[PDB]
């Protein structure tokens, strides 16, 4: 069982949205977060640049890291970003927390899951 109270809440919130609203990703992300940390996503920028597209929120069920180049003007949602990841993302787009994405888009629409 998780020990971080924040991660614990984030999951509770991801669920509350998946159930209340029509979002099916939030519950999908919640299920992956409840799983062991070793299975969580560690994604560098080179992968977001390859499979993401504009006007489609990138959802990472884990943490985003700073290796590689990101040129696309995309919105990335994650549990956490490395200091460099957040920096590189904001230069050409917008790094957002999962907690924010759930509020702005409780229906979890137009979103691409990346790992």
């Amino acid at each position: 069982s998780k020990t971080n109270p924040r991660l614990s809440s984030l999951i509770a919130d991801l669920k509350s949205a998946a159930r209340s609203s029509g979002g099916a990703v939030w519950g999908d992300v919640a299920e992956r977060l409840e799983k062991p940390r070793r299975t969580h996503a560690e994604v560098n920028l080179g992968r977001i640049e390859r499979y993401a597209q504009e006007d489609e929120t990138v959802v990472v069920p884990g943490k985003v890291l700073g290796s590689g180049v990101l040129q696309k003007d995309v919105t990335v949602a994650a549990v956490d970003f490395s200091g460099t990841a957040e920096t590189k993302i904001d230069q050409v787009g917008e790094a957002v927390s999962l907690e924010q994405a759930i509020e702005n888009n409780p229906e979890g629409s137009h979103v691409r899951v990346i790992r």
Binding site: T3, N4, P5, R6
Partner: protein, 246 residues
């Protein structure tokens, strides 16, 4: 945000910006991990004599006299763990590493998180402290560092409606168990932490349950005694500022 400074009389005297660290998300689990480390690291190595119970030429007679094969010397059993006066099978060992490591980033984060927990009146009250106030931590001017009498710090605290916490810690508990026989007969509640900048308040230190510290080295323990976040604290104008880059 902003913190209201108070003169030695208990009246407002302007206000400064509460540093960003006090906005650090409270992480009790990390704070608890840090305090467990600090506490474990000051524990002393111990263990029974490596030769206790082995100082005997005792020997087993073996089969033949209707007795168990237990080593004996002068008719009395010895050495073995099951024998009275025998060795301890698996006793405490001096060689044992009783310390705990903690990544600097993890510990530095616990300090900041603990610092932040100070700026939450509900947390502070949840932790157990007694006081009638809204703004917290209690910010005071640098002239506090020039106080000499403890009795004077009392008046200032009564003026700040924060002295009730000292009445809380003014009750020594006589612990249950043999710790008593080792000099640990008493214990008391942790009250107010006074963070200064130049030197720890000699004037406030004797106050019941009080702990004095300095901005450059105030740690997770004094910030959150026992690993419990949100301690009723009082910073100094300069301490409050110096604590921002920790």
């Amino acid at each position: 945000m902003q913190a209201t400074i108070y003169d030695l009389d208990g009246n407002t005297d302007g206000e400064v910006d509460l540093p960003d660290v006090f906005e650090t998300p409270v992480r009790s689990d990390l704070i608890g991990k840090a305090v467990r480390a600090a506490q474990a690291n000051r524990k002393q190595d111990y263990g029974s004599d490596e030769y206790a119970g082995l100082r005997t030429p005792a020997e087993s007679f073996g089969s033949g006299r209707g007795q168990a094969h237990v080593p004996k010397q002068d008719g009395r059993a010895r050495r073995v763990p099951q024998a009275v006066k025998g060795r301890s099978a698996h006793p405490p060992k001096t060689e044992k590493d009783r310390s705990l490591d903690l990544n600097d980033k993890e510990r530095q984060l616990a300090v900041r998180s603990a610092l932040a927990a100070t700026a939450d009146a509900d947390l502070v009250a949840d932790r157990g402290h007694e006081f009638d106030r809204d703004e917290v931590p209690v910010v005071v001017s640098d002239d506090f560092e020039d106080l000499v009498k403890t009795q004077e710090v009392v008046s200032l605290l009564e003026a700040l409606d924060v002295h009730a916490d000292i009445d809380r810690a003014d009750e020594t508990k006589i612990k249950a168990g043999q710790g008593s026989a080792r000099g640990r007969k008493y214990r008391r509640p942790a009250s107010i932490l006074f963070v200064t900048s130049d030197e720890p308040s000699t004037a406030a230190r004797n106050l019941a349950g009080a702990d004095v510290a300095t901005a450059s080295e105030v740690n997770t323990e004094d910030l959150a005694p026992g690993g419990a976040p949100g301690r009723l604290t009082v910073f100094t104008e300069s301490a409050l500022a110096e604590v921002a880059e920790r």
